[PDB]
Amino acid sequence: VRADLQATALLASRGFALYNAANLKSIDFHRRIEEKSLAQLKRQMERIRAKQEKHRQGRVD
């Protein structure tokens, strides 16, 4: 067990690397989700506006 625990500290920096990588991956996943959501909002917003313009021109006609 001396061996096991001596090298647990030797591979603790690798543990930190693994941790940070996983956390960053999850954070980027959430960022992607939020990016998609904002883009969806923009797509929808444009449909709403385009209609309110087909109806605006319809009023003119």
**Local structure of residue 36 (DSSP, 8 states):** H
Experimental method: cryo-EM
Distances (CA, A) of 45 to 16, 35, 52, 53, 54: 43, 15, 11, 12, 14
| Resolution (Å) of this entry | 3.2
Distance CA 4, CA 10 (A): 10
> In Å, how far are 4, 7, 29, 37, 40 from 50, measured between CA atoms?
66, 64, 32, 20, 15
Q: How far apart are CA 53 and CA 25, in angstroms?
A: 42
Angle 11-16-18 from CA coordinates, rounded to 5°: 90
Nearest to 33 by CA among 21, 41, 22, 45: 41
Q: Which two tokens stand for residue 26?
A: 């999850």
